[PDB]
């Protein structure tokens, strides 16, 4: 299928005392495998997936020394932005980072991502192409030059389509059972009070869409189970009750199931 | 497999 690798971050100002916190977890096609939390008691990289385990010891600290330096940077960032903001410094502000890259069923590089944000709205980003960035406002805007006179932006290009992907198949190769199989969702449907929804069961990966149709509809964000599987249901309003048909399809399934009953 | 370097906003 189509696979990928990502690393999510979140750093947050805390003026009072405070706690400039920093979580770090990464995802292989929406599978947890990494961990770096400051308020914790390890100050390292902890395993979370039963396949991260194998790499050597200096891999792990080959990785703690970095999320370490990721963290200390957003100390500056968090305390740099306000320079735009002229804000209070008795306020808890938030910065999230986001860089990554994907690869088709080719196993060869495809697209590449790199975006920052603050307040939960877009700050700066890196387009499809790796020449050039995305400016949101004038604050996010200033940053650009020193990513545009120093060229630091320029390199990520060496790493994303180069270093990143080989890491991904370093991961995928020995990730075979718990990273790259197709979980077929099982289905049921129910009726009460009338209201009809047809549920989908225990499916990987994340993205599915189910829907109904012609012979005012409630549904829900995907829910994680904890088994590395997922959830969704589709509240649709209908007495006579043969009604509509649920359109269920995702890669796991041979082709879209139809069952009105 | 992460960024071996880091830049400051």
């Amino acid at each position, epitope marked *: 299928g189509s696979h990928s690798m990502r690393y999510f971050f979140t750093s947050v100002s805390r003026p009072g005392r405070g706690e400039p916190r920093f979580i770090a977890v990464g995802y292989v096609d929406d599978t947890q495998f990494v961990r770096f939390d400051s308020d914790a008691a390890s100050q390292r990289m902890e395993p979370r997936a039963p396949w991260i385990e194998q790499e050597g010891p200096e891999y792990w600290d080959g990785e703690t020394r970095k999320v370490k330096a990721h963290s200390q940077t957003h100390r500056v960032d968090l305390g740099t932005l306000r320079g735009y903001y002229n804000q209070s410094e008795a306020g808890s502000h938030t910065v999230q980072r986001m860089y990554g890259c994907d690869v088709g069923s080719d196993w060869r590089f495809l697209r590449g991502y790199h975006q920052y944000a603050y307040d939960g709205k877009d700050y700066i980003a890196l387009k499809e192409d790796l020449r050039s960035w995305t400016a949101a406002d004038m604050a996010a805007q200033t940053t650009k030059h020193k990513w545009e006179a*120093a060229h630091v932006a320029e390199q990520l290009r*060496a790493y994303l389509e180069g270093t990143c992907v080989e890491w991904l198949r370093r991961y995928l190769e020995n990730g075979k059972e718990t990273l790259q199989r197709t979980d077929a969702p099982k289905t049921h449907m129910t009726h009460h009070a009338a209201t009809l929804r047809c549920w989908a069961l225990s499916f990987y990966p994340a993205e599915i869409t189910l829907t109904w149709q012609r012979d005012d509809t409630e549904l829900v964000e995907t829910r994680p189970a904890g088994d590395g599987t997922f959830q969704k249901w589709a509240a649709v309003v209908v007495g006579q009750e043969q009604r509509y048909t649920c359109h269920v399809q995702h890669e796991g399934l041979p082709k879209p199931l139809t069952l009105r009953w | 497999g992460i960024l071996g370097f880091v830049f400051t906003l």
Partner: T-cell receptor
Amino acid sequence: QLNQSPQSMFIQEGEDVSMNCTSSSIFNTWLWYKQEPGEGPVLLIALYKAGELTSNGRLTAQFGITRKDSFLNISASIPSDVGIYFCAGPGGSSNTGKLIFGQGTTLQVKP
Amino acid sequence: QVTQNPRYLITVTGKELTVTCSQNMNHEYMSWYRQDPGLGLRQIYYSMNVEVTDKGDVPEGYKVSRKEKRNFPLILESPSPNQTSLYFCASSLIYPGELFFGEGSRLTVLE
């Protein structure tokens, strides 16, 4: 390692001169520095994309489309340009913050 | 300008040294290099911004630290004849960038 050639070169007043880098890893940034004895390295030309960069020069710096070696010529030699010449390529595929410099060719100009 | 303390001195096997280099203004990524006739420039230890300890290629016989920006020291627990060279302390605000090398501090270690 980042290689460089020739060992050391001895041209005359008037002649042309040609040096080159060759790396092992893939670089997208190629920088030529020069230091005259006793001082720090000083940036001469920087290259970012494949294709040429004429500036400053006199000079002409090339980006090998291999993304794995570059070139530096100097036309109409002048004794004012004696020095140790370098190629800096901030790796890079290394996934480190390293700034790799070469062997460095020593130019000397007999007028 | 980056100031290099001290510009030239001598010592003996076993007695530690501390070569501090100043900084302005509010640059972040600085490293220390080594050079001698022969192999030319190489990189020893470097640190992007503050408190980021990163080794690099020629380490042994060295160590380093930095908890604030303005100063950056390379210390040596056991000067041995291998480290008799010519050290440089270059400077720029972010990785990568053009570097601002120093005067030229040279330490000579004797038996």
